[PDB]
Amino acid sequence: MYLSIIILPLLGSVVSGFFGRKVGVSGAQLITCSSVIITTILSIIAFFEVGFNNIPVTINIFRWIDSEWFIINWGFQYDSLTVSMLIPVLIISSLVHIYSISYMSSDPHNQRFFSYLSLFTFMMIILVTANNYLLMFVGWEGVGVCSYLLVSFWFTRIAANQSSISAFLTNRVGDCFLTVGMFAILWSLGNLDYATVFSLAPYINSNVVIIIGICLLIGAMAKSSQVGLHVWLPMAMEGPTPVSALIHAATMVTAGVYLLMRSSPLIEYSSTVLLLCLWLGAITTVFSSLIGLFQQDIKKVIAYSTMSQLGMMVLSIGLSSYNIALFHLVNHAFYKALLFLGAGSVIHAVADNQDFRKFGGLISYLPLTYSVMLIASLSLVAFPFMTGFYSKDFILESAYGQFSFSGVAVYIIATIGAIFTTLYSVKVLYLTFLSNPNGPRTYYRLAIDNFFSAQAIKSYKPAHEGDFFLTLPLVILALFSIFFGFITKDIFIGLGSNFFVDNSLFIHPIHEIMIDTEFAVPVLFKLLPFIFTISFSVIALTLSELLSELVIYFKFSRFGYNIFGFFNQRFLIEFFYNKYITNLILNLGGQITKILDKGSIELFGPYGLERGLVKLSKNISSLSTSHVTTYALYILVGFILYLIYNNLLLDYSYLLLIIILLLLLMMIGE
Amino acid sequence: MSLLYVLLIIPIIGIFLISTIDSFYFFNVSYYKKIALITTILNLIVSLIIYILFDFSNNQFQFIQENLDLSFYDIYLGVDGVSIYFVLLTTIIMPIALVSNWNSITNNIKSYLIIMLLLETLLLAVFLVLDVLLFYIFFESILPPLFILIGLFGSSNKVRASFYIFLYTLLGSLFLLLSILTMSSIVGTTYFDVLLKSSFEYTTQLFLFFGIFIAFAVKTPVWGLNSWLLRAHVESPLGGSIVLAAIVLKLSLYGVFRLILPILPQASLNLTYIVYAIGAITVLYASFSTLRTVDVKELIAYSSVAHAAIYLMGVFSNTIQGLEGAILLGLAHGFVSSGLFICAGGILYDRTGTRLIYFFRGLTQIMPLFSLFFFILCLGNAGTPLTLNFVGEFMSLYGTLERLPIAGMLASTSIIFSAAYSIYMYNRIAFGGSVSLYFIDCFRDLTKREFFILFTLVSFTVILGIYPSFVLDGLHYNISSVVYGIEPNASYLT
Amino acid sequence: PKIPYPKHVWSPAGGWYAQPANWKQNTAIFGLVIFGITAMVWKYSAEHEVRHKMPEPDRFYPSRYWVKQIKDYERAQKEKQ
Amino acid sequence: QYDPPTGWLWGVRPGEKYQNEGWEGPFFYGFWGSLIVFAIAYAYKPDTSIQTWALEEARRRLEAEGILEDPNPT
Amino acid sequence: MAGLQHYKIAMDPALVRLGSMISNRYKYFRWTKRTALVSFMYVVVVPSTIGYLAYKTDGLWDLRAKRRGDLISER
Ligand SMILES: CCCCCCCCCCC(CCCCCCCCCC)(CO[C@H]1O[C@@H](CO)[C@H](O[C@@H]2O[C@@H](CO)[C@H](O)[C@@H](O)[C@@H]2O)[C@@H](O)[C@@H]1O)CO[C@H]1O[C@@H](CO)[C@H](O[C@@H]2O[C@@H](CO)[C@H](O)[C@@H](O)[C@@H]2O)[C@@H](O)[C@H]1O
Ligand SMILES: CCCCCCCCCCCCCCCCCC(=O)OC[C@H](COP(=O)([O-])OCC[N+](C)(C)C)OC(=O)CCCCCCCCCCCCCCCCC
């Protein structure tokens, strides 16, 4: 069964992709969805075997790379973290395969799309089940290749080509740092299997831990889209919608978070990497939360809300709170996928429009979509007793519960991020459903009200809801968004919970803050997020549909105009990256090709030699006049020169200088 | 008769049959190409037989023949682990290169086949000779056939390309020859089992290193000595390009394991920083210029320069994993560059008659089979895991990092830039819009021939990317013998 | 509507709106192939997995029904008194 | 509504069949046949790797120390 | 045009002319203050910098089996 989880999504993928002509559209969907659903059941069974009974399972098949000290196997370890990661990844992948049956029903390339969907699932599973750093790197690149293919799926569109390059290259920047960190682990410990690294971590040189830790933090930044290496993820919204929900919101964006949690036994022995994790997460929270409020596309708002939640996880990891980081990762994957799939319902309902400025109404047109989108939003803003409430809010008080200046500072930072999460959460639901219709007649024109005379049987298109495959995943994910956090907090948090005693997560006792978080945090700062959430929601809802001119007054101020543009333009990072990094590299290549390789290297090389030596050859040949009297004088002068050189005991250096001089003169014509 | 002599003899027989069969039957040129292809298959079958019998942990040369008839220049043949895989690469590549030109060679077909068959014998003899001066003789012997191959079958700029590769290689080689002749004078021979026991004094090693290095940097090539490759690898016929990039670039790498590591250990260790600066510069400069190269075959040719920099840095690492990774990368480069040259110089070029990138776009729409293999090959060029290219790049890069960290860190940036030019070139050709509006006719997809040379090459890189033990197991023991150094509590046991 | 496309382009994944008339029959064979390979993988896993703690007798641990390591332990532990 | 799977594999039009260029025999039967045979032959090749020989001596030496249990005690 | 008959291509003269300029550009390189400065920077300065840094850090560090109570520095 444990191997059968690994290979089953791969088997479906090769049938969907390399034999699509045999099974067709329906055969491809039946095989992939079947092969993912069966894998999901085995994952639920695995979560009970490994996690609840605390029986880790080791499996090694054949060696991969064997050189002296490095022995890397095709080997898999199931531990409490492994089965914890597999639950969101397999369930959401099963619900996104099903959702795609309806969503892409009119696309001409269903077989290839479902092959990509199942191949991504297999690479994600490899990434979390591998028992060594390098095999994880295979799934790390595996999900990156699958992400590039799925972002560029509609490959005749130029902008989706640019986005796919951005995701491939930006992640490769983080791959380069992950490779050096693996090189540093190999150099210090002799190989990279997890057990070896984690058994020797307390004893290795503290500077070595920093080098490895910083290296794997930078790789985590790219895959989890933190402020340094974040720009790819918003651009990844160019793929089809079920890709955004599965790959860029719920599972692959969490690989960086998984890397740090799996590395917790090592990075616990480096406060430097923990402190850098702590601030990097906080920056990412406010950075994206600010940007998302000023986005005009619904998928772009949701993408920046993913970036802000992933920052909350990295923030939590910086407080040595990997269990709370894992709890938020699992919980966020459920309700954030719900928002993406609910958004996909809207985009389908209004003929692919994605701009808030053309929504409005739809509240009576998409009641089921509105309900689950509202349910998901309250989970995102950590409304009390929702699923997201149990994870996010604990992260906040844990930041305060670590009574340190950095911990207090991140609390304030992440609180402001929470404020703007509420703001753009209000912005989505209101501009889509609650506001007046800013879109055209076609969206809202119903057959109940008579408008046409002869084109009455058809020609209404009233922006209705989707079919069963479109709506069933919404209902399921809605239920997880309400009860799953409450049902499961005692596992992931507990108070002295021993779910991760296989050492999947290591928390050094000196890094414990949970006691102070439960008892030492004042009640005012515990409920402060809810006071802010329940008020800025009132402030946001009042500013629209009641005021609606004040924000306009702000926009048309030069201060507000500049503020609006700066945040809409994502702190101008894409502008400055393109100007001074991408175009810098292209111009370096232009110089190298033009001034050196097709330039100076040719002239101080073969081409210059050809020019000069042909000239030298022709000038020397000019002396050969065939005048017998001239050759006679030439013999005579040569005779005298030989006599001089030997008679006067001349310095040999003089003779060589004379020869060089003669070539100089024959360089010059006439 | 030794099996190693059979390896060198079979292609000469095929040359004889090709040149005489007109007297036993206007013979169709299909018959000629059938003879040459079967000739390469038998040579491959013999190399497979040798490998089945080959022993992975012997420090004696295997399959050697006693001479007992010593002359001034006697060809001694022998094989060990550090040469066995280059012999296999040569005997696998040669049939694929023949099939890749099955239709595109339209005139002078007999001359083309005889040159390729002669190239097979000469390149194999380079890997099998047990004498350092024999190595130079085979290394330089391939130049006149290569000059003729380019000049009889090359594209519009074939004359300038043929001259460049001949004069660059000759010039570098003349400095290697002076280094070899000095060795021959001090030791009395260049036979491996005698010269490897000699201990040259340090200043002699330094001036021996220079002269061997000048030649190997011309042949790697390092950036700045690489315009012959940017000409010859592009102007060459497709079969010439495959042989030139898959096997001929590997000569300088196998040459380092015979001519520098065992006999110049002190000069090699003291000069590694000069080697690493050149290798680091080559990795960045070649990568940036590959990004701006608009000839599709020139872009695949320039990426060979960047990959060869990494195996060159791995070969000077003086670590087991760096040395094994260098051989692994050399082999993986041979399968990947062969496939990318087939994709560009054989599939795009035959269909369009042009090599300019500006005319290609959206080929996936009409050529799905080409785009599938082309993409997998572009992942191999980017060193994606599950290809043998990742295993070689990782091991080479780890050894370079451990030997000299700043050089490895710069060399590691190849993981970013090889992806950049591979993905950029893939996107512009297969993706990047609908089918190019410059195409008047529609294009057919891969023919069965094109499919099965790409599939075979893609098969080798992926199978060895998942189980690289198939090469490493036969590398470990012999490659131990070229490492230089000691551990304090492990050395001088009593 | 549905986009037009060339009928001469052969693609292994099907092409544009590809569904053969016999798609159920073909899907049945491939699903059978998938089951057969999966079962072989299942047999390998149930023999080569390694554990260091065994499950308690009264706990829901279905692998106890096929994994060689646990099956041997349970059979040996039944020999008591 | 779905379309019937179309397309010309190897560019062979539906009326005609594939024509052999002359390379197919040697390549499929000689080149690929020999590689398949070699792979079967390689299953029966004895292990001559330095690792296999060195693992056995390493096991005995760690049996000598208090690391590995001795199947044949004294 | 090149051996085997290829498909009809709308060979755009401007693009063809650009391709010809790139093949022949070596014939028109000249030494100027700009070209000499660029060539000197790429060929001498940057390589000698990496060479100097590689020289000065050769043998400086070793990671293998370094524990707490030890230094990465060797020299
Ligand atoms: C992604 C990077 C993220 C950030 C990384 C930060 C890592 C921080 C560690 C930096 C590090 C590791 C480099 C290993 C690299 C291995 C491969 C690279 C990675 C492979 C994956 C580089 O340190 C080297 O730097 C050299 C110069 O650069 C210096 O050598 C020379 O410097 C000049 C003459 O002195 C010459 O001019 C230069 O020619 C020479 O060479 C040396 O300082 C040293 O060799 C080691 O730093 C160490 O410095 C020393 C002195 O403080 C510290 O000792 C302290 O001494 C006591 C009193 O002094 C203190 O009371 C006490 O506290 C402590 O005992 C150490 O504790 C440690 O701090
Ligand atoms: C790393 C080297 C490769 C190793 C893995 C080798 C493949 C293993 C199996 C992969 C899963 C199965 C893939 C099915 C193919 C996808 C659908 C298809 O047939 O494409 C044809 C399709 C045909 O599509 P179509 O069926 O929709 O036909 C109509 C579409 N047009 C208009 C194009 C004709 O061609 C394409 O459209 C895309 C061209 C690129 C194909 C992308 C390659 C897919 C395989 C990716 C390899 C994954 C590597 C993993 C990363 C390494 C890990 C670190």
TrEMBL record, chain A:
Q: State its location(s).
A: Mitochondrion inner membrane
EC number in record: 7.1.1.2
Keyword Ribonucleoprotein present in the record's keywords: the answer is: no
The record describes its membrane topology as: Multi-pass membrane protein
Pfam entry (one): Proton_antipo_M
Q: Which GO terms describe its cellular component?
A: mitochondrial inner membrane
Top EC category: translocase
Pinpoint the NADH:quinone oxidoreductase/Mrp antiporter transmembrane domain residues. Answer: 130-410
Transmembrane domains' residue ranges = 27-48, 82-101, 113-136, 142-160, 172-190, 202-222, 243-261, 273-294, 301-327, 333-351, 363-390, 410-433, 468-487, 527-547, 628-645, 652-669
The alphabetized UniProt keywords are:
Electron transport, Membrane, Mitochondrion, Mitochondrion inner membrane, NAD, Respiratory chain, Translocase, Transmembrane, Transmembrane helix, Transport, Ubiquinone
**One MF term from GO for this chain?**
NADH dehydrogenase (ubiquinone) activity
Q: Which reaction does it catalyse?
A: a ubiquinone + NADH + 5 H(+)(in) = a ubiquinol + NAD(+) + 4 H(+)(out)
Question: What sequence ranges are listed for the domain NADH dehydrogenase subunit 5 C-terminal?
Answer: 519-644
Give the GO biological process terms.
ATP synthesis coupled electron transport; electron transport coupled proton transport
- In this chain the NADH-Ubiquinone oxidoreductase (complex I) chain 5 N-terminal domain maps to 64-114
UniProt cross-references to InterPro entries, sorted A to Z? NADH_DH_su5_C, NADHpl_OxRdtase_5_subgr, ND/Mrp_TM, NU5C-like, Proton_antipo_N
Q: Does the keyword Ion transport apply?
A: no
Q: Family membership, please give it.
A: Belongs to the complex I subunit 5 family.
Briefly state the protein's biological role: Core subunit of the mitochondrial membrane respiratory chain NADH dehydrogenase (Complex I) which catalyzes electron transfer from NADH through the respiratory chain, using ubiquinone as an electron acceptor. Essential for the catalytic activity and assembly of complex I.
Recorded protein name is NADH-ubiquinone oxidoreductase chain 5
UniProtKB/TrEMBL annotation, chain C:
Stretches that traverse the bilayer:
27-44
Q: Does the keyword Membrane apply?
A: yes
Q: Which UniProt keywords apply?
A: Membrane, Transmembrane, Transmembrane helix
> Would you tell me the protein name for this molecule?
Uncharacterized protein
Q: Which domain of life is it from?
A: Eukaryota
- Look up and give the organism this protein is from: Chaetomium thermophilum (strain DSM 1495 / CBS 144.50 / IMI 039719)
UniProtKB/TrEMBL annotation, chain D:
Could you list the residue ranges that cross the membrane?
A: none
Q: Where in the cell is it found?
A: Mitochondrion inner membrane; Nucleus
What does the protein in this record do? Answer: Accessory subunit of the mitochondrial membrane respiratory chain NADH dehydrogenase (Complex I), that is believed not to be involved in catalysis. Complex I functions in the transfer of electrons from NADH to the respiratory chain. The immediate electron acceptor for the enzyme is believed to be ubiquinone.
For this chain, the family text in UniProt reads: Belongs to the DNA2/NAM7 helicase family.
Quaternary arrangement and interactors, per the entry?
Complex I is composed of 45 different subunits. Interacts with BCAP31.
Tell me what this protein is called. Answer: DNA replication ATP-dependent helicase/nuclease DNA2
Which portion of the entire protein is included?
1772 to 1845 of 1848
UniProtKB/TrEMBL annotation, chain E:
UniProt keyword Transmembrane helix present: yes
Span-the-membrane segments of this chain are 35-55
Superkingdom of this protein's organism: Eukaryota
Q: What keywords would UniProt list here?
A: Membrane, Transmembrane, Transmembrane helix
Entry protein name: NADH-ubiquinone oxidoreductase B15 subunit
